[PDB]
Amino acid sequence: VLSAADKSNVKAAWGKVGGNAGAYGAEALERMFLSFPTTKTYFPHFDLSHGSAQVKGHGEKVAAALTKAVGHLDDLPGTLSDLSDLHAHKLRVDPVNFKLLSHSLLVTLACHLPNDFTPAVHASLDKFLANVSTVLTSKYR
Amino acid sequence: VLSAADKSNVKAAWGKVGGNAGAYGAEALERMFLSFPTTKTYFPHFDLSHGSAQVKGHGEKVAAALTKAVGHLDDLPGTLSDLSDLHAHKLRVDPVNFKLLSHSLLVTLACHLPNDFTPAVHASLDKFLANVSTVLTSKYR
Amino acid sequence: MLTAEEKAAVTGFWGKVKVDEVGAEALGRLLVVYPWTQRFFEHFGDLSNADAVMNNPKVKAHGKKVLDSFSNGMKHLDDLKGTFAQLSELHCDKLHVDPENFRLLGNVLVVVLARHHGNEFTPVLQADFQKVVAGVANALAHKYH
Amino acid sequence: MLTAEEKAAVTGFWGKVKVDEVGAEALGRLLVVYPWTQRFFEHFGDLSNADAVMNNPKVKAHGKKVLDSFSNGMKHLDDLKGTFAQLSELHCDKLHVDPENFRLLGNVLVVVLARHHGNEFTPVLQADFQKVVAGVANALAHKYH
Numbered sequence: 001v002l003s004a005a006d007k008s009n010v011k012a013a014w015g016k017v018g019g020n021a022g023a024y025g026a027e028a029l030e031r032m033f034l035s036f037p038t039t040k041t042y043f044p045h046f047d048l049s050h051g052s053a054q055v056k057g058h059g060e061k062v063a064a065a066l067t068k069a070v071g072h073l074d075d076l077p078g079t080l081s082d083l084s085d086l087h088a089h090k091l092r093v094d095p096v097n098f099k100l101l102s103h104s105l106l107v108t109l110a111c112h113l114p115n116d117f118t119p120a121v122h123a124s125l126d127k128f129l130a131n132v133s134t135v136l137t138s139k140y141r
Numbered sequence: 142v143l144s145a146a147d148k149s150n151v152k153a154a155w156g157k158v159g160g161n162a163g164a165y166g167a168e169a170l171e172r173m174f175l176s177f178p179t180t181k182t183y184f185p186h187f188d189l190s191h192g193s194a195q196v197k198g199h200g201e202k203v204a205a206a207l208t209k210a211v212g213h214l215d216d217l218p219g220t221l222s223d224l225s226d227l228h229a230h231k232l233r234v235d236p237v238n239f240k241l242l243s244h245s246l247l248v249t250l251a252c253h254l255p256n257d258f259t260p261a262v263h264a265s266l267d268k269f270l271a272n273v274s275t276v277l278t279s280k281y282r
Numbered sequence: 283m284l285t286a287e288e289k290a291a292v293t294g295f296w297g298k299v300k301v302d303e304v305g306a307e308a309l310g311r312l313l314v315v316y317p318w319t320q321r322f323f324e325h326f327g328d329l330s331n332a333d334a335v336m337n338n339p340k341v342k343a344h345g346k347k348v349l350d351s352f353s354n355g356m357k358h359l360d361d362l363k364g365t366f367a368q369l370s371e372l373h374c375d376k377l378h379v380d381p382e383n384f385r386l387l388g389n390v391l392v393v394v395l396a397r398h399h400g401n402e403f404t405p406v407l408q409a410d411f412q413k414v415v416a417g418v419a420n421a422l423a424h425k426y427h
Numbered sequence: 428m429l430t431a432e433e434k435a436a437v438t439g440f441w442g443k444v445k446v447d448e449v450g451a452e453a454l455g456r457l458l459v460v461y462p463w464t465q466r467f468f469e470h471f472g473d474l475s476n477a478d479a480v481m482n483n484p485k486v487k488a489h490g491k492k493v494l495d496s497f498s499n500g501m502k503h504l505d506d507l508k509g510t511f512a513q514l515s516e517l518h519c520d521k522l523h524v525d526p527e528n529f530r531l532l533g534n535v536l537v538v539v540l541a542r543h544h545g546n547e548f549t550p551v552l553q554a555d556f557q558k559v560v561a562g563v564a565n566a567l568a569h570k571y572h
């Protein structure tokens with residue numbers, strides 16, 4: 001479903017994100033927790049105050065799992081298989097919540113890369129993030 | 142996707158339908174049209190009332206296609222490729238409508254096979270009709 | 283808000299629905315067919331497999347309460363926003379369920395109805411009944427959306 | 428239906444928003460990222476790729492028109508259903524747009540504001556806009572809730 005054009009744009013734009021992924025990952029979480037209050041019942045063990053160390057720390061982890069995803073686009077189901085388990089079977093995270101992070105994530109990348117966030121790149125990234133979500137919700141047992 | 146367990150369950154259910162397949166896809170269609178009026182607009186060239194030759198007709202087409210899928214559970218991408226093209230690219234069906242025809246089908250099945258529509262079978266079908274959906278909406282560029 | 287012939291066809295139907303068995307199955311089905319909803323009910327016990335859920339007394343017990351309030355939702359149909367107002371509070375402010383699952387349960391309800399009442403549950407009576415579940419769902423997710 | 432302090436931040440921000448190009452960008456992006464919505468606008472001519480769509484004068488015109496009514500409801504935050512009731516009927520009864528799409532346009536709208544306004548599109552400020560878009564979306568869904 002990811003065309004050649006999509007593979008490149010994600011690669012290109014994520015490469016653009018560079019050493020800032022961590023910071024963006026925390027920004028996407030923030031705006032998620034802030035825009036959609038439900039998402040918080042999954043982190044009642046976090047300090048969710050603006051600027052939290054824990055959030056920043058979780059920002060990186062999410063950011064890192066996306067870098068890893070961007071690198072191994074050919075095999076996502078097998079790159080993120082562990083994550084599918086944790087999130088779906090162990091944490092029982094509602095799938096709709098995946099739509100939402102994806103969104104804040106796109107709001108965040110839009111924010112920080114206006115010149116590089118073109119309709120066609122937006123398009124490709126959305127497809128990327130919906131795919132990472134599809135994989136994450138696949139193991140519902 | 143589907144465990145060997147999901148597959149036997151889908152295989153046997155559709156199996157037990159036998160030659161009322163076109164009968165039930167016709168009904169599935171009908172129930173969808175009445176329950177969710179917005180879906181009628183993809184058939185401006187149909188007569189949408191009961192027993193309509195046209196619906197009966199289209200029901201045998203859908204059901205036949207689902208039969209082919211049940212035949213080929215391990216490769217739907219392949220087996221449905223030509224239908225993904227028509228529904229995504231040519232016909233521009235809103236993906237949400239795939240969730241609705243699926244619901245229609247379950248109701249339909251539930252309603253002719255109350256005996257055989259166990260919660261286990263129920264789950265297995267639902268996971269199956271979702272894969273079908275995912276493939277029918279993948280060629281979306 | 284409802285052709286008072288629909289309203290009548292719905293009540294007319296409702297009054298022969300074995301509400302507690304319809305209640306137990308719908309809930310059991312939701313937890314089986316959509317497991318992530320199990321997160322809210324793991325205080326109910328062993329939910330490992332299809333039977334374990336369908337036989338779980340606490341489950342059966344609760345779905346009866348769920349179909350009870352759907353039931354008394356039926357006798358106050360043009361008001362609804364308010365019949366449900368404080369259960370919205372509950373789910374959407376204490377328990378924190380994404381509204382999507384009210385629609386999901388409402389659609390399990392429908393499928394259970396058809397399985398129970400076979401060829402009575404005609405395309406018409408269903409369309410009428412979807413408007414209802416859609417209504418119970420929209421009215422529940424009030425404390426937010 | 429958004430605590431006073433929330434209408435303040437939103438309306439105050441909204442004056443800085445060049446409605447003409449946010450409109451155009453919003454609507455073009457919807458048709459590119461969500462290719463099936465194209466079916467509704469095929470009367471606008473060539474939408475075969477994102478240059479034809481983004482440059483198509485008629486998408487550009489409709490963008491302003493859409494955000495103009497948006498920017499109008501912004502002055503009636505206490506009565507969204509009121510304002511959009513008419514536009515509900517068009518979209519729902521004449522156009523047959525599925526309600527899930529109103530929410531998709533809100534979300535893309537949000538993204539564009541982000542792109543035009545940088546770190547001024549603060550997390551707190553977005554939260555308020557998320558409430559503004561769901562509100563409009565409901566208003567619009569109205570004429571069948």
Ligand code: HEM
Nearest residue numbers: 039042043061062065066083087091093097098101132133
């Ligand atoms: C693109 C989507 C997502 C990705 C890539 C992702 C990634 C990750 C990673 C890498 C971990 C921890 C692995 C480790 O520490 O060893 C994790 C844990 C977790 N995730 Fe996600 N996540 C995503 C979406 C979500 C969503 C939507 C939620 C729920 C709102 C969520 C909730 C959690 C929770 C509650 C944890 C465990 C918290 C903890 O470690 O204490 N994730 N996720």
Ligand code: HEM
Nearest residue numbers: 180183184202203206207224228232234238239242273274
């Ligand atoms: C799993 C679900 C579905 C399956 C298996 C399926 C299968 C089919 C098949 C076999 C055809 C006949 C094509 C041909 O004869 O060349 C068809 C056509 C068509 N389908 Fe679907 N379909 C599904 C869902 C939907 C949905 C949800 C919609 C939207 C309401 C839809 C709308 C259409 C339309 C508008 C046509 C063209 C029929 C005509 O113009 O004569 N389909 N589909």
Ligand code: HEM
Nearest residue numbers: 319322323347348351352369373377379383384387388418
């Ligand atoms: C038609 C939609 C629904 C109705 C009418 C409904 C109704 C009710 C009722 C009557 C109660 C119990 C109040 C009492 O015991 O006095 C309840 C509690 C509860 N509901 Fe729902 N509910 C609905 C949907 C949902 C959904 C979809 C979920 C999540 C998947 C959910 C999760 C819960 C939970 C976790 C409780 C607490 C029960 C306990 O602590 O054991 N509800 N609901």
Ligand code: HEM
Nearest residue numbers: 464467468492493496497514522524528529532533563567
């Ligand atoms: C925030 C949500 C929306 C708002 C505020 C909105 C507003 C409007 C307005 C002001 C008009 C033109 C009526 C006039 O000429 O005065 C319109 C027309 C139209 N809208 Fe929307 N709309 C929304 C969502 C959508 C969506 C999601 C779609 C479909 C994907 C859609 C499709 C159309 C179409 C096809 C027309 C007719 C175009 C024409 O031929 O003039 N709208 N809408």
